Amino acid sequence: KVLEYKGKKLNFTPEDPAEETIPADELHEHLQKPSTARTKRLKERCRWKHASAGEFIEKSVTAGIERMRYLTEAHKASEGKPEAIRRALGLANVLNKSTLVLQEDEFIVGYHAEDPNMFPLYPELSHMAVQDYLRSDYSPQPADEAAAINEYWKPHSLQSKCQPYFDPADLGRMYQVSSMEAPSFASGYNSIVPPYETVLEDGLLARIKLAEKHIAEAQADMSTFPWNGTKGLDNIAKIDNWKAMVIACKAVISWARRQGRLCKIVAENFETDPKRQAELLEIADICQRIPAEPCKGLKDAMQAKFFTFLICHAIERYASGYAQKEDTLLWPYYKASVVDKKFQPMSHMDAVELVEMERLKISEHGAGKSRAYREIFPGSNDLFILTVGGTNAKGEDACNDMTDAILEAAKRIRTAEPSIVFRYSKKNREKTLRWVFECIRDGLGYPSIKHDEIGTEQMKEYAKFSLNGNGATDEEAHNWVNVLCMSPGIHGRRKTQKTRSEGGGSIFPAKLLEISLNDGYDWSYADMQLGPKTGDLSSLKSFEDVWEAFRKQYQYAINLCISTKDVSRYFEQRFLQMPFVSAIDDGCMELGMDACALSEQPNGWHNPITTIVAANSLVAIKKLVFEEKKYTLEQLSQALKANWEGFEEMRVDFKRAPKWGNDDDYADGIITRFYEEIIGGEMRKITNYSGGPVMPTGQAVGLYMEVGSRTGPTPDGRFGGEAADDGGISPYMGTDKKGPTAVLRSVSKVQKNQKGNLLNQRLSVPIMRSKHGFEIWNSYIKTWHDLNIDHVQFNVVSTDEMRAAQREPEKHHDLIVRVSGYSARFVDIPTYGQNTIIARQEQDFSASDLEFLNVEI
Amino acid sequence: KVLEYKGKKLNFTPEDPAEETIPADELHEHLQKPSTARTKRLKERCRWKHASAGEFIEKSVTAGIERMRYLTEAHKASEGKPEAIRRALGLANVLNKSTLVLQEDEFIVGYHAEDPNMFPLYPELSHMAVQDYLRSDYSPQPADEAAAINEYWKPHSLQSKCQPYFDPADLGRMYQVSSMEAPSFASGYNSIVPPYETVLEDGLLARIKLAEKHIAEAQADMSTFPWNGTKGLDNIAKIDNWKAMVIACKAVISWARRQGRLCKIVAENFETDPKRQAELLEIADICQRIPAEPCKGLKDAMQAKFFTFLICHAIERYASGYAQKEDTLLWPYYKASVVDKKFQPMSHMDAVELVEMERLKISEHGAGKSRAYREIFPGSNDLFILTVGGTNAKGEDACNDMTDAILEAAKRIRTAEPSIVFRYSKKNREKTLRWVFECIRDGLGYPSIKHDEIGTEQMKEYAKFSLNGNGATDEEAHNWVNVLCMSPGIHGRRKTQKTRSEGGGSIFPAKLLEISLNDGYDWSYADMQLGPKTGDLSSLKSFEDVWEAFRKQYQYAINLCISTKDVSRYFEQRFLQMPFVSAIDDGCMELGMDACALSEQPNGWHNPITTIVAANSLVAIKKLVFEEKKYTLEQLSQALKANWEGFEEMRVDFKRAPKWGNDDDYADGIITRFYEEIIGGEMRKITNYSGGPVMPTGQAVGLYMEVGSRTGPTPDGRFGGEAADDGGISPYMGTDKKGPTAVLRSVSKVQKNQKGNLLNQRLSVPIMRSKHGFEIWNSYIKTWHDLNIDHVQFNVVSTDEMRAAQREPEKHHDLIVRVSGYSARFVDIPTYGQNTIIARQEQDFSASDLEFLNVEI
Amino acid sequence: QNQPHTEVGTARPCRSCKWQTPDPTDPHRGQCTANRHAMGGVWKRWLRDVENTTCSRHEEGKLSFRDHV
Amino acid sequence: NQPHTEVGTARPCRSCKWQTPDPTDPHRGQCTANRHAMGGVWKRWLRDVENTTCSRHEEGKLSFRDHV
Amino acid sequence: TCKQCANFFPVPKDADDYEAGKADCVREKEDEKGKYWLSKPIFENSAQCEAFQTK
Amino acid sequence: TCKQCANFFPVPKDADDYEAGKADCVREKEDEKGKYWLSKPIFENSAQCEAFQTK
Ligand SMILES: O=C(O)/C=C/C(=O)O
Ligand SMILES: O=C(O)/C=C/C(=O)O
Ligand code: SF4
Ligand code: SF4
Ligand code: SF4
Ligand code: SF4
What we know:
The complex is a heterohexamer, with 2 copies of chain A (857 residues), 2 copies of chain C and 2 copies of chain E (55 residues).
Chain A: E1 2-5, E2 8-11, H1 37-44, E3 51-52, E4 55-56, E5 62-63, H2 66-77, H3 83-97, E6 100-103, E7 118-119, H4 127-134, H5 143-153, H6 158-162, H7 168-174, H8 184-187, H9 196-202, H10 204-222, H11 229-232, H12 234-269, H13 274-289, H14 298-315, H15 326-339, H16 348-363, E8 385-389, H17 401-413, E9 419-424, H18 430-441, E10 448-451, H19 452-463, E11 480-482, E12 488-490, E13 506-507, H20 509-516, E14 521-522, E15 528-529, H21 543-575, H22 579-583, H23 586-591, E16 605-608, H24 611-627, H25 633-641, H26 648-655, H27 665-679, H28 681-684, E17 695-696, H29 703-710, H30 740-749, E18 760-763, H31 765-769, H32 772-787, E19 791-795, H33 799-807, E20 816-819, E21 822-825, H34 831-838, E22 842-843, H35 847-853
Parallel strand pairs in A: 5-7, 8-9, 9-10, 13-16, 16-17, 18-19, 18-22
Antiparallel strand pairs in A: 1-2, 3-4, 10-19, 11-12, 14-15, 20-21
Helix pairs in contact in A: 2-3, 3-12, 4-5, 10-12, 12-13, 14-15, 15-17, 16-17, 17-18, 20-21, 20-24, 24-27
Chain C: E1 5-6, E2 20-22, E3 30-32, E4 45-47, E5 53-54
Chain E: E1 8-10, E2 22-30, E3 35-43
The structure holds fumaric acid (2 copies) and iron/sulfur cluster (SF4) (4 copies).
One iron/sulfur cluster binds next to loops of chain D.
InterPro entries (chains E, F): BssC, BssC_sf
Protein name (chains E, F): TutF
Binding site for fumarate (chains A, B): 484, 486-487, 500, 505, 607, 699
């Protein structure tokens, strides 16, 4: 294109001139540049386990059975013992009897199943999930033994413990995933923020010694005259917890050392290449010393990180995510290895190759989650979200050479997972910002940008509610990462989030609006009463009546949402203890408590998904039905029940009604109230297990497509089964004609009672691949920061490339797009989601847009 | 004899003149006078299950299996459910599948085993006890099924839960029952004070309705917007507890009604006598309405009382005792039936016959306790101790016609159990007092006397320490009964003691003094180190050094005792819930808590047994070893290791040293310091689970025989294996040579830091059985009350009748004697205990003795 | 007719129909995706019973992931 | 005359008439064979009733009257 | 074959513990002490024992 | 059997997981993606598998 700006003629020609000789519909097939030949071979040989539409993309991926079998064995043997010690014994049995895997060209080693094409299962979490796996084509084998395991675990499963405290009608409404996401105890889905810092600094031997010292001190206190029954009995649970930590840590050390032994055996007996043999011996020594001893170099740190990830996200319990401050966590070891060359001496490109291998190992991590969460992350194994950038405790820029290494590896290897979040501050140096823009302009979809000051202030605010008064300090508040996709949380040796029961889960306003217009009866999907009987159409005489009906629906739904999580946490700390995670947490170790019992930092939240559809529907109802009396509510209900068939003129009238993201005063006025007074305002009144408030972390993450299919037609003009809004604050597909700046100003208006909101923006490809684009992108980020919007993520892919990919998937396998909250391989996304992504407006910048953005060419 | 008193001539000739025509060696065989022929038939055919030396006296008594069988089934089926609901389900299964028993001539019906000659067992409490039962001749059958049941229960037993938290050496020291009684979790022994008042006043249907109302309110609170995670989760345990209460109460109602149905069936199909048929129909209707509905008459009250006792002491859990304020509890229904004749009209003699039948039913109650407690209550089924007399809330006399009916039934029917405790006050009317003296003069040993004011002040003082501020009020403090033998505790609808973990268990000073003289090494019994190494003999240079060595031993032992009890309670409330007891407690029902969790009234205590042996030994050590330097500590130790062989002169010198109970200033000074500074002083430093102090309740209860047989020779003059003192404060047998008044003054000297001290005294037969008996006994009790002595109990038996019963046991079946805190059939006591009882000094009253007592003829 | 109906022990269950995908939470339930609007919407219907339910549009087989949501 | 350990003895302490099982642990025992002339029954503790014997071993079992 | 015993007394339908086919097996016994009666819950179709009285 | 396999590597005495007779069964496996190795804990006395190579 060509833009006239302040007299200058801006030519949007790709920086690399050779890009003029590459066709536009295959561009992304020529952008990957693996740093070494080893990472190229690894990218070609990668065992991707992406999942979509509830099934796995590849026929080679199948569930394992070793974890179920060994956990069941240990549980049958540990009857009568303290539940924490029983959990430690279960983890120990799984780790001691599991098959270990070593693949060719690997440097970071380790796996979470008995075979590199498999993934573990979790019969202790949700028996319905294992039952769904048994009925699936990728079931664990032998099938009868897995069925016996599930039948044994059903009475002890977390689902069976949590369900007796709720109306079966409520749970039936929840499990439909239409107006409310199913509770985590019914699905087994979870998240965690592991304290990698403790593992990397201390080593597990130190944690064992600490737990043993505490045990001896407690036993001596129990034998101290004179005994005090009102204080001494507190030592029983502490001793149980500390013994569980010792068992789990000894098991993990033995497990890592057996992996190193496998490395040495393959070096001495199976491998022919002497270079490969020497490398295997080096890895074997690493796994020998790590994680028993503190980390001394960067390779030590990365191997320890991967071991801790395997235990905290796959083996001890299932937990989605990849939460960590990778650059801050790895910087001391980068300085030891690359800068100072004191232990494991390497160059910067060596660290780049190491991060490449880390990304590929994560790309091979199959997640044994339930069907619901094999549906809502199309085109990816799971959610893997790390955080870099930000500010330190003294408010100075936290960017370093390790951030640049991570970003360069992510740009070179072009893998969808793990996704990256960059906490942006004005303090952030321009070199790292150029690397972030390098990743974004290549269409990877990451790093997403988050407002650093907003997150730090949020951490400070939540810390005030701490039950033991040990919330994050003002200095600790700067050390935060995204828990899964969008919600900030503390990272470090202490006070990190340990379960999704603390925060997470979704509520869907679109279905709530639909049933508000039908007295709480979901006729479109389940033909059943999905909500309270807020009133028939004759009762909704004023717009305020519809507003209050939605308020009642929202209150009922969100109350169930948070209460299920708190009950899940109650039973998690009593029967689903994580002694290993508790061992590497300084607070759990000091207090002798389980990771789920102790909660020094509140972070309660819930995700409103499909908010903008309901908001636009409300704006259209107020505009046409009530204010202008052009259509009656009964006419609208008759048309909606008809799926707009024979009412097409009315459907277009409602579609053209004022919409979010056009800087429209009418639509934005109502929708800002909807966000702050209802979506955030009513949810804020709820208090969670930690004593903090629950605030909305708006996002969509694929559910927007699944919920929309389950949702019926809406006054917004959507037909039934049409996809909902892509992002929580994002404008709906093809509803924005005023350009990017107008969308930014609409997003700017909602500043109250939101813990986070997700904005998805599609930027023009020519401007981005042009030299002018980094300056435009920096200007947008600076305006967005001054606007105080919480988050922004960018997709830069031509429709032509995507349409070609739909027609020829094998040709377009390299291309990566961004769905909301994460990045996916386009060819692995179903046509439904691909079309929702294609229909996102590719935003072009005018002269007035740049003038608003304060661009200086 | 004939004693001249102040010039008047007192001749001690029996009131009954036929006693001059009965020879003195068979007297007590001709005193029983059953009120009706039915109770006479019941007395002749009574199925006594007396126990001695750890075995059962009769070969017809054998263990049952139904309780073990059905509890095991219910526990296997209830896995995964809340532990309280699991306990309720176990009780429900036992009650629903149990065989019910109806015997001839019974009016109060009901049993706790499948056969009238059998008793239940408790595999959930202590697996060692069940193992001991399996190796016994009275083992449950089939033996292999019982062994499999114990193998199933071992990992889940309470003993297995408590043992991991103590040094195995410490537990090994306790389990010998030599210096410290074994902890209740190791034996299964227990006690309880049931809230009979709630059952008799409300009926279980009301409790079920109340629990269901609470459940509904809690669930509605859990679904109330907005949810509060710091408050709503408290409802989970409450709902679990209330549902367990509903299950248990419905089971008990169904069980009682099935018993009534058995009565009706036997009336309609098996019985020929029309009088018996009508009686059976009456009992059947009673069991239909009782305990589902409130009691309306005296028969209702007695049947309900017996059912509640069966559940609280045998079926839901083992619990020794018969704790209740029987006259106060039964008075409204006696007044309804006998005085006002409003429902179930009866005469006074009818109530006497009813209490007779109750006493015989208790005489048929076999206790499935462990071997240790089949050893230490020789000559009785178990401990059954009820309390009558006392004062009401206003401080007025609590004696009534029901008290006299109970005492009259105890007088005519001559059964050892239940024993009676009479709380004495100056307010007590003279009519009841003679009924008390009527029982005592017959040699029954009961009713025992307790100081009312001391108990009431004790309840107030303990109430101050209540954790939730709901201790007994000053009015409630007057309503107290003995828990087992000697310790006061609140009775009523609320705040009653629910487990022996609150108070109970024993510690033995004689063995402690022995090991103090041997650096903590038990050479005499086990050849093992039983206590801390307080010091060798050359280190004990001062008498104060010996004192301090004993203090260190005592502190170690008492700390172990109280800590074992509190750990037992922790695991009782977590895995041994008693939902039925919780249902009939107003506090547990109101708060939705288990009977073992809630402790609104502290009552902590421990029993020092064999105190006077240690006290006299210390007095003799100071006398001869230090003050007179006649023997060195090494000479004394050499004599002890030789069992005084060749050291007889030394043995007589130590025996002739000043002893307790002779009003010796030297001995009483040292022993009073011993009681107040060490026995009471060190124990109160310890605080129990309820937050109250732990105070000594001195008593022997037969343990004195066993511990003496396990104790080596002592400086008091004992040979190895000889029995110790028979009470908490009683003088050692045959060591009091100054008459009864000197014993009274000595006992009165001890006033600080005690919760109770048992006093055994033997009064002369002619004086008590003469027409002057009451006046002398009343003067004795009046002076004993003015001397502020805690307790006294009497034996009225001549040595000749006891020797004749030893020679001709088959002709003295109705001879009843008093041991310590309980009464036993003399012929069922082993020769060892019989000889200890015979050797007690039969005291006689001089002129000066009566003058001290203010006897006015 | 074309809408689902109950048939006890039917030979053509929703379980074997290509338009069905198991429920996200309860594998005993299902989602019928046979109502495909011309504008791309997949108007799913909930299925309480996947073993004894059928309609006229029953087709044995299984769609690829591209044809599901 | 003192108790000694004999592996699998033909006459264990368990079957001796002078023995009564331990009050807490049936694997232990109480030897009541040292009866003083003055009435004392000086019991001695037995760690193992399965592999122990002395010279005074007499198979049988006293009545309760002869025990403590 | 545990239904036509003379000791088979069906539980009334109005009883709290009533189940389909449940009944009380009530027998009489006597030893040297006295005479008693035992009521055990059994079912209509159940195993018969040695003491089956006809009708 | 299952002891003289070329895939039978006895666990070193000093290893944290050492037991009497324990060993690693280490195989090399290859599909369309790549070549990997599997190490499962077995014992000297254990059942052999389909592919036994003599050491
Ligand atoms: O756990 C969740 O549901 C979401 C987390 C996030 O988006 O941060
Ligand atoms: O339970 C005990 O050891 C004693 C109780 C009492 O004497 O009340
Ligand atoms: S049989 Fe009919 S209702 Fe069932 S899944 Fe197939 S199309 Fe849907
Ligand atoms: S064999 Fe000897 S030591 Fe053993 S019980 Fe008999 S007398 Fe005692
Ligand atoms: S159990 Fe025996 S006695 Fe009872 S009803 Fe059946 S066959 Fe008759
Ligand atoms: S399992 Fe097979 S490959 Fe492994 S050691 Fe045994 S025979 Fe060899």
